Amino acid sequence: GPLPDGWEQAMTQDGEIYYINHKNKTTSWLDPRLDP
């Protein structure tokens, strides 16, 4: 869905999507806003 805008979902060729958080400088695979 629409992310908090700190992180962007990029697709790695291994077949996994990862969020690069430019604000917290941290990686997390899946959409955290879909958590609720």
Partner: peptide
Amino acid sequence: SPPPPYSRYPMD
């Protein structure tokens, strides 16, 4: 797996 370092994008 732990997500790759945000420093750069994995090409694999």
